[PDB]
Amino acid sequence: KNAAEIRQQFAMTAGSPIIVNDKLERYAEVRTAFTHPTSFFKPNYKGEVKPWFLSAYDEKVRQIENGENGPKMKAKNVGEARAGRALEAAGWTLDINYGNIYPNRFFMLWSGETMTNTQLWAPVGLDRRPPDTTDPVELTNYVKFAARMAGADLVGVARLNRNWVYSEAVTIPADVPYEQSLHKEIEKPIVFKDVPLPIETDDELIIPNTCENVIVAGIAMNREMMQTAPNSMACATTAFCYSRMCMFDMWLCQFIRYMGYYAIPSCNGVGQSVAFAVEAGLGQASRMGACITPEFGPNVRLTKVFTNMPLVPDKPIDFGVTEFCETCKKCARECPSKAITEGPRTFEGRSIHNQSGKLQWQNDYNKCLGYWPESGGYCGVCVAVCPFTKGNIWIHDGVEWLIDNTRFLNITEVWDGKINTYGLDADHFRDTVSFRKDRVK
Amino acid sequence: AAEIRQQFAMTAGSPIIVNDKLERYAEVRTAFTHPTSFFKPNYKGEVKPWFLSAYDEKVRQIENGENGPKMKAKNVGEARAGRALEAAGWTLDINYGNIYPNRFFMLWSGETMTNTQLWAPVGLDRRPPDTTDPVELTNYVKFAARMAGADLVGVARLNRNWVYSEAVTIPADVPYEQSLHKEIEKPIVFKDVPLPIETDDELIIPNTCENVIVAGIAMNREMMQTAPNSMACATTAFCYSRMCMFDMWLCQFIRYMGYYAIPSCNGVGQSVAFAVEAGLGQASRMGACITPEFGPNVRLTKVFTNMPLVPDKPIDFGVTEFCETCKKCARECPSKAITEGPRTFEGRSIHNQSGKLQWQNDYNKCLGYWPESGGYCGVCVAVCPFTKNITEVWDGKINTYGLDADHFRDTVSFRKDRV
Ligand SMILES: Oc1c(Cl)cccc1Cl
Ligand SMILES: Oc1c(Cl)cccc1Cl
Ligand code: SF4
Ligand code: SF4
Ligand code: SF4
Ligand code: SF4
Secondary structure: HHHHHHHHEHHHHHOOOEEEOOOOOOOOOOHHHOOOOHEHHHHHHHHOOHHHHHHHHHHHHHHHHEEEEEEOEOOOOOHHHHHHHHHHHHHHOOOOOOOOOOOOOOOOOOOOOHHHHHHHHHOOOOHHHHHHOOOOOHHHHHHHHHHOOOOOHHHHHHOHHHHHEEOOEEEOOOOOHHHHHHOOOOEEEEEOOOOOOEEEOOOEEEEEEOOEEEEEEEOOOOOOHHOOOHHHHHHHHHHHHHHHHHHHHHHHHHHHHHOOEEEEEOOOEEOHHHHHHHHHHOOEOOOOEEEEEEEEEEEEEEEEEEOOOOOOOOOOOOOOOOHHHHHHHHHHHOOOOOOOOOOEEEEEOOOOOOOOOEEEEOOOOHHHHHHHHHOOOOOHHHHHHOOHHHOOOOOOOOEEEEHHHHHOOHHHHHHOEOOOOOHHOOOOHHHHHHOOOHHOO | HHHHHOOOEOOOOOOOOOOOOOOOHHHHHHOOOOOHHHHHEOOOOOEHHHHHHHHHHHHHHHOOOEEEOOEEOOOOOHHHHHHHHHHOOOOOOOOOOOOOOOOOOOOOOOOOHHHHHHOHOOOOOOOOOOOOHHHHHHHHHHHHHHHHOOEEEEEEOHHHEOOOOEEEEEOOOOOHHHHHHHHHEEEEEEEOOOOEEEOOOEEEEEEOOOEEEEEEEEEEHHHHHHOOHHHHHHHHHHHHHHOOOOOOHHHHHHHHOOEEEEEOOOEEEEEHHHHOOOOOOOEEOOOOOOOOOOOOEEEEEEEEOOOOOOOOEEEEEEEEHHHHHHHHHHHOOOOOOOOOOOOOOOOOOOOOOOOOOOOOOOOHHHHHHHHHHHOOHHHHHOOHHHHHOOHHHHHOOOOOHOOOOHHHHHHEEEHHHHO
């Protein structure tokens, strides 16, 4: 199996693959089901209406008390139930309020000047010296090498399509301390202006018009843990990867800054990761709505960094995902909340949570979020059942690579079973080896 | 690899031979911190803190298009990129090694952390442990350790001989910008208290703090082989930030299981001794812990806890006898810091802890080469048999976190090999 061959075989010609029409407008981040008032509140198992994550907390507590790893899923004993939630909670250690979405706060600073690392290194002046390399070809090789050092299992580059940048971000005022953050969230416009550096004013988050490129990283989750969806160990691989995302953004932004350019981190903030990932060639959009990659299927998290560093955009990829999703529908049939549509793609949003004006399968994400308090986790059944999440999809017929159509026709054992560093799998880790030829052409 | 480690397991008992002279070692005595070794001249002849003199050499090298001492880069751009990667790798590390205990990332309680506050309604850190079985806990915590980025993990009873008698730290209210100028010494003591606690006068570890969990964090072979040049600095630096994330992740897991946990990175005590007692590897002539999987090309961090655990067995795969006749690190060392002589119980200088049988090296000679070369050397690690240009590294093989898929299978783990 040769992942590089596969990507070469299915590479497209240049151009954003996402089909759009005239009703497309940039999307206010507050509209996501996590944040919007119509979906933010959910009942707990006692019928009390709370912020959804607090209702989910109540269900986690109830499951531990009852020795369960998930809804109606008995654990080996209470200690096993306890251990799954402890692993999940610890995974979030380097993530603020589930996703690091507030731009230019906490870990997501838009300038490195106040960071302890920048201060320590200031006598070398790497962040003030003009770039010594401006060649996009060399820069792309350098920045992708750095990206792999920084924990990315996949990395791609695209020109920044502003359609996918949130019109307004969810954030907090700069004078609000952490313990009040969840009570003091606000909206703030993201605007593009003729300014030298990313800068935040009292009224606006300002991205320079020179911010040409976006670097997208894929952060692979653990197959065995995700297959326990919707139970606790799927929550744990999700959580650990959010902290890997945060480390990646900070590492990479600092490299870019020390190369003489600016860099904006984001994790789950700033813009829509799936669209950037598609335009950067990591994978294709899917019925469930995730980016499906050849290496990991949808079982991979995304983050991204925006920069004026000259780079060579990668080519999009088309390995037949749209055509398999047309006939598969497994995620839609298994979804415990019936959130995923079984119908065709449209340009018309299903509800406020969807951005209209782009051709996609339109899913009801309030229904999805509604299952999270009920199950006490982050579900993931769609990711777990997707055939592309299986590690064994690719076959070679003597001429070229193809997808095996036959693929589309417990937690104690996970704790006692195979694991490796960062939950990566040595049986497949060769798929993400990288030489210069697969970083830049 | 799991076969090899079981083949070479020793019977229980610390393999470090000590005498009646041994005393705990004050952290300020390391060459990084001690007043006799801290100040070094830069290439212009100006005496500065050693790392500021090293900074000056990094700038001079970038300006001259060099990747290291007398090592021309392909161009100035390549020189710049190696130093930018090095500087970036340190992002999650305070002042080179995170040594100040109970400051910044190294908090001895989880209570004030943003993650603990967000998770407070679940009460995992306040709920008594549901598991007290050391067998099950060893399996759980080792699984978590691998999730947290350890390539190797072992457990030993805590030997207080390797805990620093006094830590280097800063006053609690000193802002970061003044930290380097306000470092102080502070005793680490053990007392009958329920939880790790810091007073004005003391860092207090509970007498119940029975165990230490030691993690090995593998460095990249291609990059370390550029020692003493900039790409060896870069793999060193990234692994320090991996160490910090490991400590915080694992401490939070242990706390959410009902126990307490003290992170440390390069602080609190001597990592090499803990790693040997936990069975990760054997002490060596250069002074590092040599592991079967990575030789010495692996960083160490460790977490201290009262969580019940099953100690691992020390390992003997012949390192002492091989180092007896090898001496390659000693012959290649650019500062002649590593001895070609036999092991003794008497240190060569203030930087060594006397009273334990080891090869005694002159660590002020080692440090003196760092401002000269503008990096963190590592030639000894690079040339060591157990470990086995810069443009070719940048254009060549890489994978996630610098790990190597040709060897990654060696660190696969099932419960059989966890406990
Ligand atoms: O994206 C997530 C957020 Cl923002 C919160 C909890 C779980 C997930 Cl997967
Ligand atoms: O341990 C180190 C410290 Cl403490 C500073 C710089 C480089 C290294 Cl390897
Ligand atoms: S489960 Fe099937 S329909 Fe759903 S995303 Fe995967 S391939 Fe597409
Ligand atoms: S996460 Fe669960 S509830 Fe949400 S779309 Fe996927 S299967 Fe459905
Ligand atoms: S790091 Fe370099 S100078 Fe120091 S002991 Fe090793 S070879 Fe010698
Ligand atoms: S180079 Fe030889 S003598 Fe030095 S640590 Fe390695 S095996 Fe031992």
